[PDB]
Amino acid sequence: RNLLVIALLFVSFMIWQAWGNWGFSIIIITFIVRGIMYPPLGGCFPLLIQMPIFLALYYMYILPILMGVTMFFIQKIMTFMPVIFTVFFLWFPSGLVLYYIVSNLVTIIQQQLIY
Amino acid sequence: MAAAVMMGLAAIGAAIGIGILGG
């Protein structure tokens, strides 16, 4: 509980500080990679793989809400690395709402399958 | 610098997690 209390403040601190075709191919390659993960090591390989794919996706206010609601379902090291990934995304918001909802909805059903 | 922000960021995050988790 205390460590969780130490992840949320750090997120809040971060938030306060902040205050074509070739891309569609990189979205599809990211899905094939997310699909190999689908049905500490067993979290660590999906969690390492999550980084090169979110970088490829999003190199190519509302997105922090969508990822924050995604994080509240994940919360409700294996949580702590998704929280550090969330903190980086509070400083670097990038993407488009419809696609970011589809990618995070595939996060919700991948988390409901690790469930 | 695109590649260095790309595979700099993730490939090290990879490196430590293989190390942490898989250790």
Residue numbers in the entry:
A (entry chain A): 5 to 23, 352 to 371, 419 to 439, 465 to 480, 494 to 532
B (entry chain Z): 11 to 33
The article reads:
All bacteria contain a protein called YidC that inserts proteins into the plasma membrane of bacterial cells. At present, a mechanistic understanding of the function of YidC, as well as its mitochondrial and chloroplast counterparts Oxa1 and Alb3, respectively, is limited by a lack of structural information. Furthermore, the region(s) of YidC mediating the interaction with the ribosome have not been identified, and the oligomeric state of YidC during co-translational translocation remains controversial. In the resulting model, the conserved membrane integrated core of YidC forms a helical bundle arranged like the vertices of a pentagon, in the order 4-5-3-2-6 (clockwise) when viewed from the cytoplasm.
In order to provide a molecular model of YidC in its active state, we reconstituted purified full length YidC (extended with the C-terminus of R. baltica YidC [Seitl et al., 2014]) with ribosome nascent chains (RNCs) exposing the first TM helix of FOc, and subjected the complex to cryo-EM and single particle analysis to a resolution of ∼8 Å. In agreement with previous structural studies, YidC binds to the ribosomal exit site, however, the improved resolution now allows for a more detailed interpretation. Secondly, the presence of elongated structural features allowed us to dock our molecular model in a distinct orientation (cross correlation coefficient 0.865). Following placement of the YidC-core model, two prominent densities in the membrane region, one next to TM3 and one next to TM5, remained unaccounted for. Given that (i) YidC substrates are known to crosslink to TM3, and (ii) that the density neighboring TM3 is aligned with the ribosomal exit tunnel and (iii) that at the same relative position nascent chains have been observed inside the SecY channel, the most plausible assignment to the density near TM3 appeared to be the TM helix of FOc. To verify this, and to exclude that the density neighboring TM5 corresponds to the nascent chain, we reconstituted single cysteine mutants of YidC either in TM3 (M430C and P431C) or in TM5 (V500C and T503C) with RNCs of a single cysteine mutant of FOc(G23C), and exposed them to disulphide crosslinking. Thus, the adduct represented indeed the inserting FOc TM domain crosslinked to TM3 of YidC. Indeed, mutation of residues Y370A and Y377A (contacting ribosomal RNA helix 59) and D488K (contacting ribosomal protein uL23) severely interfere with YidC activity thereby emphasizing their functional significance. Finally, it is notable that we observe only a single monomer of YidC bound to the active ribosome. While SecY is known to translocate hydrophilic nascent chains through its central aqueous channel and insert TM domains through a lateral gate, our model suggests that the YidC substrates are inserted at the protein-lipid interface.
